[PDB]
Amino acid sequence: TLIPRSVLSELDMMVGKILCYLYLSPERLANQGIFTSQELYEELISLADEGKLMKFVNQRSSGSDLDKQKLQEKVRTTLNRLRRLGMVYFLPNNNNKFTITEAVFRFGADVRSGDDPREIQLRMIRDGEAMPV
Amino acid sequence: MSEYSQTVPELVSWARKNDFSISLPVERLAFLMAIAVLNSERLDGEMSEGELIDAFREVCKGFEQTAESVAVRANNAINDMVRQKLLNRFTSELADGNAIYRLTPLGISISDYYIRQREFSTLRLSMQLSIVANELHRAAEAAEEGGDEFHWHRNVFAPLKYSVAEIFDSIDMSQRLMDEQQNFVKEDIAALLNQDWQAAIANCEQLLSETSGTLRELQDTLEAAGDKLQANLLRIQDANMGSGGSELVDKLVFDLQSKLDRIISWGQQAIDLWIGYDRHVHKFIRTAID
Amino acid sequence: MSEYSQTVPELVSWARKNDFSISLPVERLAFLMAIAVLNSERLDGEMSEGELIDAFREVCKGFEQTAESVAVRANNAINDMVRQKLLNRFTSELADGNAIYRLTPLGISISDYYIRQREFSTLRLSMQLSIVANELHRAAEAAEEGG
Amino acid sequence: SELVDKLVFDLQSKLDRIISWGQQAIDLWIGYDRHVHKFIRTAIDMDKN
């Protein structure tokens, strides 16, 4: 390439795959696409390993509220980066609420076909879609 | 089935697999004690994260430590206490993410050992012996009245297991406290003899006589009550043997008899050890005077 | 008199002055629990130094540690447990120079918390409430009788 | 007797704490129970294909 290429962080992926599940969820379709940072955070902690994920915020985290607020602020920051990428749009007057777009489906590129995960991953790296860490 | 179902090798393997460890340096121990005191002054037995941080700040101030990173240090200390099983943390969605803290049975036992001024009381022992004598008498009467497995489980096994066994454990703990008090008197006698031995002879003789008198009063109280307690345990054993014989009641009565024999034997052994030390101190005083 | 006669600053100053500390790594904690199990199987509630060294040898085997210097390590562990107020050491001339060891209330509380399988029992609670109700009722009758 | 009054007050305070703890534990357990049931229902029933 004549133009530089870069990769997203693993926290960005966690927020990306969660935003993807949120888009699909018919249970929340009644919101008309408007979600709140707190709802996103609540869904994320419901699915992923909370205490093990906390390791990325700080190597000494053990469930303290200061560390929980630090995690929430990192989420707030990464979500803002995804907005610049065009993956989510904030409301015109309220920044605690936002709307999703279909571009988030790229986070599901590792599972859209019901096949061997290793082979899928190999195919993706071969196509230049994704790198390991 | 032995209260401790695990052999020493099974227990050591279990402890190693679970990675259990306790590391409470002076600052961490002071913080645990401050938390225990703050919890005792409250109406709900619950502490918030901010209140724990304020308590840690007071400990850091008492240790004249730098006010830098105190919030981080307090979080590390709180996480360490939770990680060492001294505090239980409750994270409720209803509490908007605010965690509620309560001390564990372990954290309370360690903090109470240092903060609770436990003195051996002949009155406490006499009361505990009076309650257990009444409980054993009621269990013996119920055992002699006879009945079904439900009568024996509710009126004989439950009182022996959940009341008599706990009071015997409390008496044993009081005896262990007396063991510590004797070691404290020994340190005081060694200190009085190291400062001014000539002026300390009268004080040492008084401490030796008073400790001997207390041990004798305790042993006399235990011997006087011990026979009545052993008679009631034998009444229950005879009644159990006559009404088929629950192996669970027999094992429990045997454990209680063994604990009672240990409680009675401890008093005689403590008196013998104290007599040996008394003779040693008098020999030392005679050698120093000569 | 509040069971805890000292304010937090007084307690902190008192703790700092007496230099109280507990250091129980996994091996020392396992040694304490081993001593508690061995003591509960005995008729005299007393342990000799040789029995403590053997108990420590059994723990060292469980930690897959070398049998070299086990006696020195055992003596250091025993001295450390005595220094941390987990074991009371009695040296009687009558015991032919042999030291007797007994677990302290602290050593028993710590060992029981991990080894005693304490499960909540509704029957236990109902019994405890029955005893306290009778004790409070007698105390109330005695208070009303006056004296 | 100031000693008996203080002791009775302490025991009453302990009894209130003992009674209050049970209701609080039930509320915390209910919050979790509702959350796990909601999660299971969302996981099971809302994906239909």
Numbering used by the authors:
A (entry chain E): 81 to 213
B (entry chain D): 1 to 290
C (entry chain C): 1 to 147
D (entry chain C): 246 to 294
List sentences quoted exactly from the publication behind this structure:
MukBEF folds the chromosome of Escherichia coli and related bacteria. The SMC protein MukB dimerizes at its ‘‘hinge’’ domain, which connects via the long coiled-coil ‘‘arm’’ to the ABC-type ATPase ‘‘head’’ domain. The heads are bridged by the kleisin MukF, whereby the C-terminal winged-helix domain (cWHD) of MukF binds the ‘‘cap’’ surface of one MukB, and the N-terminal middle domain (MD) binds the coiled-coil ‘‘neck’’ of the other MukB. MukF also recruits the dimeric KITE protein MukE.
Using cryoelectron microscopy (cryo-EM), we demonstrate that ATP binding opens one of MukBEF’s three potential DNA entry gates, exposing a DNA capture site that positions DNA at the open neck gate. All three conditions enabled the reconstruction of a state with engaged heads, and we pooled the datasets to increase the signal and obtain higher resolution (STAR Methods). The resolved state was free of DNA, and the neck gate had opened widely. The neck and head regions of MukB adopted radically different conformations from what we had previously observed for the apo and DNA-bound unloading states of MukBEF. ATP binding and head engagement had triggered the detachment of the MukF MD from the MukB neck, which resulted in a swing-out of the MD of about 180°. Detachment of the MD was facilitated by the mechanical distortion of the MukB neck constrained between engaged heads and aligned arms, while the MD swing-out was stabilized by the binding of MukE to the top surface of the heads. This surface is formed by the engagement of the heads upon ATP binding and is a highly conserved DNA-binding site in all SMC complexes. Our structure reveals that occupation of the top of the heads by MukE and DNA is mutually exclusive, suggesting that MukE senses the DNA-free state of the heads to open the neck gate. Our findings show that MukBEF employs a dedicated mechanism for opening its neck gate, converting the DNA-free apo form to the open-gate state: (1) ATP binds the heads and leads to their engagement, (2) the neck distorts and releases the MD of MukF, (3) MukE binds the DNA-free top of the heads and stabilizes the open-gate state.
